[PDB]
Amino acid sequence: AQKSFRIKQKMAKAKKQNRPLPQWIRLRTNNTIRYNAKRRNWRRTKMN
Amino acid sequence: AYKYLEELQRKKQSDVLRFLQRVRVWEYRQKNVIHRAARPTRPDKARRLGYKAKQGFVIYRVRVRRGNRKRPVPKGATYGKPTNQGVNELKYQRSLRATAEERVGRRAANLRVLNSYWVNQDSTYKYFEVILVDPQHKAIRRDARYNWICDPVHKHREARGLTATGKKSRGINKGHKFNNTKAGRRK
Amino acid sequence: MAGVKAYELRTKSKEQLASQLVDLKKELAELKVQKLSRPSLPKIKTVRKSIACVLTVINEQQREAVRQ
Amino acid sequence: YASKAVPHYNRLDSYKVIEQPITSETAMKKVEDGNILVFQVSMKANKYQIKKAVKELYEVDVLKVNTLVRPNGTKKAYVRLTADYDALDIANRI
Amino acid sequence: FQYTLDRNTAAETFKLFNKYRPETAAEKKERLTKEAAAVAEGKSKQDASPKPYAVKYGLNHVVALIENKKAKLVLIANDVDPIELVVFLPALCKKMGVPYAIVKGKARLGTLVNQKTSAVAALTEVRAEDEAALAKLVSTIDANFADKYDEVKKHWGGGILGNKAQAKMDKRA
RNA sequence: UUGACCUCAAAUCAGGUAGGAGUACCCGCUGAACUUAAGCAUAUCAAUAAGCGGAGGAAAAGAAACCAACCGGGAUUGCCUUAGUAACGGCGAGUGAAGCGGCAAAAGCUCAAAUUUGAAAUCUGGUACCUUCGGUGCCCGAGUUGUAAUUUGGAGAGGG
RNA sequence: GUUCUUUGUAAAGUGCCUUCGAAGAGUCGAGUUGUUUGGGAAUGCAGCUCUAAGUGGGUGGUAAAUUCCAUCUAAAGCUAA
RNA sequence: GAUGGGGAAGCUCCGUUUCAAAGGCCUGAUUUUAUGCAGGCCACCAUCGAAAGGGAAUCCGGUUAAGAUUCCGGAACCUGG
């Protein structure tokens, strides 16, 4: 699958936000809510 | 002069009116759907309706198509009673020349249209001719004895109904009618 | 600028506010070439917002210009 | 032709325009065993621009520039160096 | 290849009823010439006229002024589009008294009015003149175009809607 | 050989213009059936939903080609009434609005048709209270020019 | 506040005379087709034909006729709540 | 599948083969670098539509945690100037 940027960039983002909850935010003096909660699993939900 | 012309074109058919309507239609007919302005064909009772004068000048011509109503579909169908069932012969509430006024508008509303005059009739159309004034323009609002057309809403309305033939084909009556509605009414 | 603003507001040439800007820039860049652990940044942020102060103060004193 | 109004101001610029010294584990190596500086870029990389960039900014000279569109958004360049620039040597910057 | 449009116009403009209607043909048959290369005596007099004989200039004006009788040798023009306007004139010319004159170049009768077009032009002054003009001219011209309007319908023809001028010069009521 | 008149164009050549959007509610066009009739066509549903094209702060309407008996009344708009009544109707099922009355808000007006063929209009330039493409001037230059002013419910008189 | 007052040939209000100026056409009305209305031989709308008048037309909630009478000026406009 | 246009109340429908100015370009050209002209081809009836069709030009060796007919070594051929 030799892609195209349109689907490239996007592919790349799948990556960029494929990451576990930040952990700082966990203690922002306010609330913060735990868990990435938006979590693509390249085996569960799927891209485009 | 204006008067002679007015009461002159008041006698149709008639030698001149005819031997003229003929050349002309034989001309006109052949010249693109609408074929914007030239220099005002019949200026006579054109003044009666704020003639040429607008804005500096601009009065375009359009051939609408004659006849009754093209009921689309192929079918019915839809039950039929209260047809419904009927198709070939519905009749257009529109106003034949009205359509003309609208299209003219579309073909360019750089202006706004003051009113539209007849001119001739084949068996395959009805040769109507509309007027303008380019509000988004000059003296139109400058030497505005007429900025009426210019102000906000009174514009493009060359088919919101508030025109003349629509105004007529609706309710400019007063008494003996249910013709200002809307309404509906009455609940 | 890095201020002020009340400073950059006057008044060296486009070819003066120039190497001021170019300066702060070679700053920001090297400031990046740091990139090593922490990182704070902190004055990467400083140098940055400033970079703009310059940029904006730079695109007006050429505008009121065109405005003549 | 003709006119009487126009655009506005020469905004900008548009250039700059070499990102953030993309150098890690393997990159350093590039700038080592091979002598080929692994900077990065701005995806809208004007291409031979990169040339004019480094050749200007770090100013030494370069020979090839093969430039992958890394999996990130990272559009990272692969620059070399004529008999001049000795990598770590022109790693005065980084 | 769209000059045709107008070309072919003139074509049927002749072809169909090769005359047709009123002096609507007078402004045709008797037009093609009207009013000779003898008219240029008029269109030379009425040339430097703005010095020896004032001038006219006034379309509707010349209409009410052939109703107000103070007119001159009034010459109506060949050209006309519509021909509607100047087709009035051909009637209230004798129906009042003036000496009609279906003169040549429309735009010429706009030369003799320091303006672009224009409509039919006339007069009402001289004294030098008064003879020279009205004499040879109004004699000859009034003869031609007038005794022409006599029949003139045919030749062609019709001098149509008199019932028109009837209406018009009636009307006032 | 040399000017224009005229319909027709072509200009990145100058300068504006629209086109999309959009809860409600306004101007239109275009148009169902479900439904009730204990059936079903008539019809009701309904000038309703859907579809389309146009506005606004509202919109639309409005100085009557009205209502009216005598009596008379006097642009629209809205409300209360008029009235579930005049009518309309397989006169079945159901439709069903008006107009001297009391309210609410209050405004009235300009063209075409008439002459002395315009001294009225666009611009663009110079300068101008207005500080660069700009509120309006003046003078001037090209261009417009059946589109400068009284007169339009009532007549003001229109002319003398 | 108006240090102005370019004008005052700038405009308004009697009885006297001039079928006094004369006022919107493919329109008005009609035949017919559809449509719509509470509209009923009684709505408007729009098609296709036909097509006026000028002591003219429109209307007057049954079609004709003929007298009369009553009442407004249509087929070009703007306009606050 | 836009446009020359034509249908449709209208979203839009229909037409690329039967309808100004053409479409531009070209060498020479009125030329000291604009731009007519000498002459030619002239609705070219826009453009989209192939990672198997059409189709300029590379290969061997070496290399990595993970690439490669590219990186790098050597040796090449094409295209435009």
Curated annotation (Swiss-Prot), chain B:
Its main location: cytoplasm. Component of the ribosome, a large ribonucleoprotein complex responsible for the synthesis of proteins in the cell. The small ribosomal subunit (SSU) binds messenger RNAs (mRNAs) and translates the encoded message by selecting cognate aminoacyl-transfer RNA (tRNA) molecules. The large subunit (LSU) contains the ribosomal catalytic site termed the peptidyl transferase center (PTC), which catalyzes the formation of peptide bonds, thereby polymerizing the amino acids delivered by tRNAs into a polypeptide chain. The lineage of its organism: Eukaryota, Fungi, Dikarya, Ascomycota, Saccharomycotina. The keyword Cytoplasm applies. This is Large ribosomal subunit protein eL15A. The gene is RPL15A. There are 2 genes for eL15 in yeast. PROSITE patterns: RIBOSOMAL_L15E. GO terms for cellular component: cytosol; cytosolic large ribosomal subunit. It holds the Pfam family Ribosomal_L15e. It comes from Saccharomyces cerevisiae (strain ATCC 204508 / S288c) (Baker's yeast). Signal peptide: none annotated. Residues 162-183 are annotated as: Disordered. It is found in: Cytoplasm.
Curated annotation (Swiss-Prot), chain C:
The modification Phosphoserine is found at S13, S50. It is found in: Cytoplasm. GO terms for molecular function: mRNA binding; structural constituent of ribosome. Keywords: Cytoplasm, Phosphoprotein, Ribonucleoprotein, Ribosomal protein. GO terms for cellular component: cytosol; cytosolic large ribosomal subunit; preribosome, large subunit precursor. One of its GO terms (biological process) is maturation of LSU-rRNA from tricistronic rRNA transcript (SSU-rRNA, 5.8S rRNA, LSU-rRNA). Its main location: cytoplasm. Belongs to the universal ribosomal protein uL29 family. There are 2 genes for uL29 in yeast. Component of the large ribosomal subunit (LSU). Mature yeast ribosomes consist of a small (40S) and a large (60S) subunit. The 40S small subunit contains 1 molecule of ribosomal RNA (18S rRNA) and 33 different proteins (encoded by 57 genes). The large 60S subunit contains 3 rRNA molecules (25S, 5.8S and 5S rRNA) and 46 different proteins (encoded by 81 genes). uL29 is associated with the polypeptide exit tunnel. This is Large ribosomal subunit protein uL29A. It comes from Saccharomyces cerevisiae (strain ATCC 204508 / S288c) (Baker's yeast). The gene is RPL35A. The chain holds residues 1 to 68 of 120 of the full protein.
UniProtKB/Swiss-Prot annotation, chain D:
It comes from Saccharomyces cerevisiae (strain ATCC 204508 / S288c). GO terms for biological process: cytoplasmic translation; ribosomal large subunit assembly. One of its GO terms (cellular component) is cytosolic large ribosomal subunit. Its main location: cytoplasm. Keywords: Cytoplasm, Isopeptide bond, Ribonucleoprotein, Ribosomal protein, RNA-binding, rRNA-binding, Ubl conjugation. It is found in: Cytoplasm. The chain holds residues 46 to 139 of 142 of the full protein. Belongs to the universal ribosomal protein uL23 family. This is Large ribosomal subunit protein uL23. Component of the large ribosomal subunit (LSU). Mature yeast ribosomes consist of a small (40S) and a large (60S) subunit. The 40S small subunit contains 1 molecule of ribosomal RNA (18S rRNA) and 33 different proteins (encoded by 57 genes). The large 60S subunit contains 3 rRNA molecules (25S, 5.8S and 5S rRNA) and 46 different proteins (encoded by 81 genes). uL23 is associated with the polypeptide exit tunnel. GO terms for molecular function: RNA binding; rRNA binding; structural constituent of ribosome. There is a cross-link at K16 (Glycyl lysine isopeptide (Lys-Gly) (interchain with G-Cter in SUMO)).
Swiss-Prot record, chain E:
GO terms for cellular component: cytosol; cytosolic large ribosomal subunit. The keyword Cytoplasm applies. It is found in: Cytoplasm. Its main location: cytoplasm. Keywords: Cytoplasm, Ribonucleoprotein, Ribosomal protein. Component of the ribosome, a large ribonucleoprotein complex responsible for the synthesis of proteins in the cell. The small ribosomal subunit (SSU) binds messenger RNAs (mRNAs) and translates the encoded message by selecting cognate aminoacyl-transfer RNA (tRNA) molecules. The large subunit (LSU) contains the ribosomal catalytic site termed the peptidyl transferase center (PTC), which catalyzes the formation of peptide bonds, thereby polymerizing the amino acids delivered by tRNAs into a polypeptide chain. Present with 238000 molecules/cell in log phase SD medium. There are 2 genes for eL8 in yeast. Belongs to the eukaryotic ribosomal protein eL8 family. Component of the large ribosomal subunit (LSU). Mature yeast ribosomes consist of a small (40S) and a large (60S) subunit. The 40S small subunit contains 1 molecule of ribosomal RNA (18S rRNA) and 33 different proteins (encoded by 57 genes). The large 60S subunit contains 3 rRNA molecules (25S, 5.8S and 5S rRNA) and 46 different proteins (encoded by 81 genes). This is Large ribosomal subunit protein eL8A. It comes from Saccharomyces cerevisiae (strain ATCC 204508 / S288c). The chain holds residues 78 to 250 of 256 of the full protein.
